[PDB]
Amino acid sequence: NENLFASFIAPTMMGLPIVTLIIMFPSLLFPTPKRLINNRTISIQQWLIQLTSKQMMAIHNQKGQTWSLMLMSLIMFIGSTNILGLLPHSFTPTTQLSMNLGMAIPLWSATVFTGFRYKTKTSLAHFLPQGTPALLIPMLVIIETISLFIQPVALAVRLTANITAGHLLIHLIGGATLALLNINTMTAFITFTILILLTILEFAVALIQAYVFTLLVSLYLHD
Amino acid sequence: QFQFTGIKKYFNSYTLTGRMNCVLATYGGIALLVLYFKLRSK
């Protein structure tokens, strides 16, 4: 009975203040120069694109490369709006589940209607995998279609659910420091747990690779 | 605006499939209906 942890009971509030300012604000962090040589703070933004434009280009190699100049705009928005919110009292728009159901469905259904305007038969004859055995036709095409319509829900809900899960352990491990007016040795160890956990919460960049990329595979496979 | 003709060549290329927010509008507009209904029955 040496080190008694404490807790504080307080509501954890994802309120909704004025959003249409907060969305526009990580656009003005990135400038664009009309010059040949630039000014050594855009120049490391301009290099960072020319890496990861050479990995969502290499797989496709089609005349579906026209689509890929948009997919690098999709990575900078939720790459920024997940990285701004680590600050003391900032607010992330990708916390709320509303816009992510408007980021999945106008993009996911832009893929199944891409081959249906050109191929019209073999896009969803990709439901036929192989040299058909007899015992498992109805067990297959009720499975590979129930794992198609999961994909818009599978794409949006994986983003909202772990981003907000980062924010609660920021509060709760952090709030247990404030309410630790018992023995002062254990206060540092909870603080040292925080400054490790904030390094893990720069996997909010790592979770945007797993949103543009499984949009490519959900584009490359259909087209 | 001139927030159009910089990206107007891009739009009618891919908004043929990309501008299908009607399914988002229908799945949004129906999602409006169940929440006004539960507060009506409280």
Binding site: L69, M99 | L32
Partner: peptide
């Protein structure tokens, strides 16, 4: 929290994809 009702943010997201397709469109070649 478990927020509700959704008439908000999603109309203010597609105005943003007129901005990001304006900045990033003026980039250069290696």
């Amino acid at each position: 929290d478990t927020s509700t009702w959704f008439i908000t943010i999603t109309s203010m997201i597609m105005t943003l994809f007129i901005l990001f397709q304006l900045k990033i469109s003026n980039y250069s070649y290696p």
